[PDB]
Amino acid sequence: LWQTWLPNHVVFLRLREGLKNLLTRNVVFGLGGELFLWDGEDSSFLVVRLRGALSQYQRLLCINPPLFEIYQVLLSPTQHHVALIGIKGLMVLELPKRWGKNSEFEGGKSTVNCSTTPVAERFFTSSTSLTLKHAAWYPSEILDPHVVLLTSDNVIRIYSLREPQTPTNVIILSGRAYTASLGETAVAFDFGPLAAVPKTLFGQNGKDEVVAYPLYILYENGETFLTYISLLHSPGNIGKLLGPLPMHPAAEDNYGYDACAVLCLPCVPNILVIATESGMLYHCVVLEGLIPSLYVFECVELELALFSCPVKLHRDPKCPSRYHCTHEAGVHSVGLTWIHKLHKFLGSDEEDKDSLQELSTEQKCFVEHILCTKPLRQPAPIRGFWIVPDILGPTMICITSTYECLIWP
Amino acid sequence: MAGIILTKVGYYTIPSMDDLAKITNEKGECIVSDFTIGRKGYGSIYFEGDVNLTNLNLDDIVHIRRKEVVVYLDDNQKPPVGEGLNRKAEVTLDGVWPTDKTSRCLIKSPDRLADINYEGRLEAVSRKQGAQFKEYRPETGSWVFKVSHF
Numbered sequence: 350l351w352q353t354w355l356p357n358h359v360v361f362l363r364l365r366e367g368l369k370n371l372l373t374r375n376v377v378f379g380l381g382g383e384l385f386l387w388d389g390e391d392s393s394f395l396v397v398r399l400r401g402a403l404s405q406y407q408r409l410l411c412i413n414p415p416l417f418e419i420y421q422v423l424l425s426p427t428q429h430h431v432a433l434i435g436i437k438g439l440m441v442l443e444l445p446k447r448w449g450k451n452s453e454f455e456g457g458k459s460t461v462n463c464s465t466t467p468v469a470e471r472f473f474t475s476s477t478s479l480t481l482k483h484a485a486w487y488p489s490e491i492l493d494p495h496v497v498l499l500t501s502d503n504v505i506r507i508y509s510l511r512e513p514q515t516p517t518n519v520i521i522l523s524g525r526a527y528t529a530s531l532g533e534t535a536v537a538f539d540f541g542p543l544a545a546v547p548k549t550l551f552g553q554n555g556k557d558e559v560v561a562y563p564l565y566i567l568y569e570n571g572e573t574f575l576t577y578i579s580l581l582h583s584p585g586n587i588g589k590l591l592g593p594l595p596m597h598p599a600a601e602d603n604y605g606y607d608a609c610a611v612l613c614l615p616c617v618p619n620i621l622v623i624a625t626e627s628g629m630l631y632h633c634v635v636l637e638g639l640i641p642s643l644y645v646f647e648c649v650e651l652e653l654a655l656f657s658c659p660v661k662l663h664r665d666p667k668c669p670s671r672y673h674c675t676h677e678a679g680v681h682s683v684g685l686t687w688i689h690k691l692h693k694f695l696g697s698d699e700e701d702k703d704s705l706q707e708l709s710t711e712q713k714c715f716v717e718h719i720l721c722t723k724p725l726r727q728p729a730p731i732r733g734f735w736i737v738p739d740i741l742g743p744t745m746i747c748i749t750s751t752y753e754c755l756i757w758p
Numbered sequence: 759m760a761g762i763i764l765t766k767v768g769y770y771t772i773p774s775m776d777d778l779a780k781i782t783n784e785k786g787e788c789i790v791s792d793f794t795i796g797r798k799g800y801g802s803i804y805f806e807g808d809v810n811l812t813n814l815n816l817d818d819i820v821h822i823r824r825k826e827v828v829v830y831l832d833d834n835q836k837p838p839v840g841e842g843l844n845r846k847a848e849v850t851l852d853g854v855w856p857t858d859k860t861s862r863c864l865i866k867s868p869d870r871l872a873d874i875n876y877e878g879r880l881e882a883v884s885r886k887q888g889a890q891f892k893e894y895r896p897e898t899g900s901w902v903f904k905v906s907h908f
Contacts, residue, residue: 525828525831525832526821526823526826526827526828527826527827527828527849527851527887527889527903527905528825528826528827528887529825529826529851529854529880529883529901530825530826531883531886531887532883571859572859593857593859593862595859595860595861595862596859596860597860598860599858599860599861600859600860601873601874602873602874603856603858603859603860603865603874604859605874606879
């Protein structure tokens with residue numbers, strides 16, 4: 350079983366020896382029965398076959414490598430492309446084809462060249478100080494791959510791989526100056542699940558229902574915005590941005606500032622997880638309004654479940670009610686056992702808020718510190734996190750700052 | 759006027775533009791100590807010590823907005839540190855209040871601002887930009903902070 354021998358595979362020795370020679374890091378992704386590990390020093394992927402030896406791996410080389418550091422790697426919805434995400438750029442790698450009885454890339458050659466294409470290359474060279482804050486794929490598994498980029502200019506741009514230098518859609522959310530509104534800028538976003546929406550939502554007609562995905566956008570000051578995206582029917586310049594979503598109930602501390610991460614759990618009504626650098630996790634029910642609102646069902650303080658570090662949120666492939674949190678102290682698992690009690694009809698009127706409040710007094714989420722990376726001297730964040738989905742029990746892979754491969758359970 | 763240009767509505771100087779004219783000497787040089795330039799209702803910039811305002815286009819150099827201020831629009835047309843208006847200064851921005859995430863109203867109550875320690879938030883917002891927080895006045899939302907230069 351790979352859960353036993355994977356921590357001893359030579360790829361981790363290779364990566365570890367590469368150390369001796371900001372975005373949160375995730376240098377690993379899984380596909381099929383294979384694990385992909387980004388080797389920054391060689392600008393290539395190390396591919397280990399988990400299903401079907403400690404020295405065997407394939408190296409997937411970038412024909413044209415990125416010169417900026419890769420912080421995160423992200424497999425596309427159709428699983429034919431990988432986004433190579435850095436602070437100073439984004440590059441998309443096309444995976445090669447497989448063949449042979451073992452379904453190895455290009456028949457099991459030790460080394461395979463992969464085509465790459467830079468994205469939005471103009472914006473990162475023209476404006477030297479322009480940085481990438483967050484990136485993800487448009488969730489569709491049917492359309493051409495589209496990447497979604499949030500840059501430090503507080504603008505979101507969508508690019509087709511067919512025209513990687515020209516946005517298909519722009520979302521203006523609205524440093525030379527001294528400013529007090531330093532937190533009125535987006536730090537992250539996340540797509541919600543597929544939804545059918547009236548075509549009238551995008552200005553067209555027919556009373557017909559079209560595919561769209563809700564896009565939730567998080568400001569540093571904790572404010573949240575919402576817009577629905579349809580690559581076919583959305584305008585080139587999207588202006589129907591809803592928010593800031595009112596956050597209920599009123600909190601004495603106004604839910605603070607310094608929000609750093611957002612996650613939309615795949616449920617209806619949508620539920621947002623908002624994380625802060627201080628370790629606060631807010632679980633927010635999105636209540637339909639035309640502006641929806643948020644009901645903070647509960648809050649979790651990770652500082653108590655063990656703190657001024659960036660927090661990264663991960664969905665669970667099996668259960669919409671569970672997610673995971675990675676930080677300098679390790680990994681927390683959070684189970685929202687109350688998700689299944691919320692019905693699809695919920696609304697934003699007063700009686701619904703009172704029912705949610707009453708329900709929150711008899712329901713609590715389950716939080717567990719499953720992996721501890723705390724040192725003996727300076728704590729270091731993990732470099733990789735992946736949940737291998739097996740129906741017989743999810744296996745979690747966590748790559749430490751020194752490229753140790755921790756496996757849980 | 760002997761050199762200085764300031765015409766944008768709402769802007770002013772202490773001493774006034776008229777006073778600066780009379781301060782100009784025989785050879786046409788306007789040197790003043792503790793000079794202030796402000797925009798009524800939005801903020802002001804206090805320059806302690808002597809500064810040479812001779813032939814400065816304050817309309818093009820100084821920009822005061824709500825919760826924001828700019829001095830010299832681009833770095834190329836900026837003098838070195840210590841010369842011109844690119845020097846130590848005390849900035850005051852008015853109408854600086856946080857927004858209630860529930861009601862979406864501005865929080866102006868001193869007790870409410872002490873509850874959420876908005877003062878400590880402004881101290882952090884100052885350091886992150888290379889400034890030193892000095893004080894905050896709730897009644898007018900006046901955020902005062904010192905900068906080493908612009």
